[PDB]
Write a protein that binds this ligand. Structure first.
Ligand SMILES: CN1CCc2ccc(Cl)cc2[C@@H]1C(=O)Nc1cncc2ccccc12
Ligand SMILES: [Cl-]
Lengths: 302, 297
């Protein structure tokens, strides 16, 4: 029993965290095999942040301009290339701690663990979700650039996020490990704003199923709903539209608890109308949306 | 910016997780140097049950490597299994017993394999509100102090309310619990007052000031109110511990206490503090400083 916000064990990722210095800028890199991946904004100066030409800045750099530190060991850069917003630094040593890994691009609503690092040193691990507006609500200070998001399903680390910047609202923007940003963001100091955030409906329903599995049924009702009627109500509370794919994804949890997805949708509709009335669901007074259907099954079974 | 429930990097502890099998029971062990520590319930008169066991009855597995047991001893509710091989991945470590209100990271394991890491606090009732299924017994709680892992918890059991009970690494239980299937209940829980205040300072640091007021309070008046809401008494030591956060935000500890006093009597009124509609009590004053300054391990 119990439901906690749970992160994947960070060990396999800690073994890949290095410090990358270019000029005055110092951030984190991901050392996998003989490549160190880091945000390309490490090559930017003070006046090269509003409108930087990264191809122009990178052509002026040599291998010895990039200082890479793995613990107390200075790694030798033997090549450099840029792939979208990520800088790939070829090094003369393959990381012996390189785990089995994949580069995966995630969709909004997906969750992942973040190993927050400063100067190539891991300081903390937390779980978070890709928000529907493509931002993440992380805990990041200056120097956290290059910190990574991942999932460790089985023995393979799926890298899905590299932290790049903080938006004016305190939310964070970054890229997949191929340098492609999530959302309409660019790696420049220009006026950028996160789109209006919405609640990840499929995740709230999954978390309501997790509560049913843990013996919490106070919120259940005798009603069901059509998918269209649920979406008309959900939209009014800034909830993401629930698609047929989401209903199908919730199938195993529906079978395990005996509560049809559209029946749980009716509980959610009612919670949205009434609030909690001093009650909590899984120790929370708000509807939690950062647990996917896959997370609920994993935590409530193995 | 941002405030998350953050755990210590679990890497140093992952290298120590092994699987311990005795008869039909399989749980986790902590392999430090040439000793594997695990709950004694893996084997009730525990001295009588242990005297009937031989070294070869305990199967210890480190990944796909069987560790041979060369000795066994019991220290309170922990079984110490002497192994032939010293763990090469043994970090710098200490065994520390924590106080209720202190936080730590839990590396949940099933069959000697780490599956998740989460942060939690030792409740004032000595239980942890964890997340554990069958096979999690032997999972450990820890803090990281520079490069030294302070082991503070070993998971033993789940109470009927879904909360958890365990011991320090010397086998001494946290709370009035015993390691057997019997009628055991967690005491009435209380809110960790010093941690709520620290989390209110973390909210101020993140730009959340709606709950601040012009008022202050005496420590005695605050404790008379806090006792009415099932909050732990705030001591002078707590006030002193909150000193750096008070200096950093310019809000005196007793001034923040009057904000907590108004929050207890009046509620949040549809508002949230750090994305929460409840007062969070599982972040200590040190956790807030560490997360709002950036300490690395
Ligand atoms: C240092 N510069 C600032 C401007 C800028 C502009 C564009 C880009 Cl692509 C990156 C940056 C980085 C940055 O945002 N760093 C940060 C990343 N995450 C949390 C931060 C918390 C506070 C301060 C900076 C943070
Ligand atoms: Cl995805």
């Amino acid at each position: 029993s119990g439901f906690r916000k749970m992160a994947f064990p960070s060990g396999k990722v800690e073994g890949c965290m290095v410090q990358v210095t270019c000029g005055t800028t110092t951030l984190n890199g991901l050392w996998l095999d003989d490549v160190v991946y880091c945000p390309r904004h490490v090559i930017c100066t003070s006046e090269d942040m509003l409108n930087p030409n990264y191809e122009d800045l990178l052509i002026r750099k040599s291998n010895h301009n990039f200082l890479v530190q793995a613990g107390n060991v200075q790694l030798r850069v033997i090549g450099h290339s840029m792939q979208n917003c990520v800088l790939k630094l070829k090094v003369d040593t393959a990381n012996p701690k390189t785990p089995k890994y994949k580069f995966v691009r995630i969709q909004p609503g997906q969750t992942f663990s973040v190993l927050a690092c400063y100067n190539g040193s891991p300081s903390g691990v937390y779980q978070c979700a890709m928000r529907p507006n493509f931002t993440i609500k992380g805990s990041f200070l200056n120097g956290s650039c290059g910190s990574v998001g991942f999932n460790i399903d089985y023995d393979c680390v799926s890298f899905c996020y590299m932290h790049h910047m903080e938006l004016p609202t305190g939310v964070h923007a970054g890229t997949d490990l191929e340098g492609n940003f999530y959302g309409p963001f660019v790696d420049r100091q220009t006026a950028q704003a996160a789109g209006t955030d919405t609640t990840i409906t499929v995740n709230v329903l999954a978390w309501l199923y997790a509560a049913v599995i843990n013996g919490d049924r106070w919120f259940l009702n005798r009603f069901t709903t059509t998918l269209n009627d649920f979406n008309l109500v959900a939209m009014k509370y800034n909830y993401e539209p629930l698609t047929q794919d989401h209903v199908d994804i919730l199938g195993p949890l529906s079978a395990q608890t005996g509560i049809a997805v559209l029946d749980m949708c009716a509980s959610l509709k009612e919670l949205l109308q009434n609030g909690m009335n001093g009650r909590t669901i899984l120790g929370s007074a708000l509807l939690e949306d950062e647990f996917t259907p896959f997370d609920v099954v994993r935590q409530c079974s193995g």
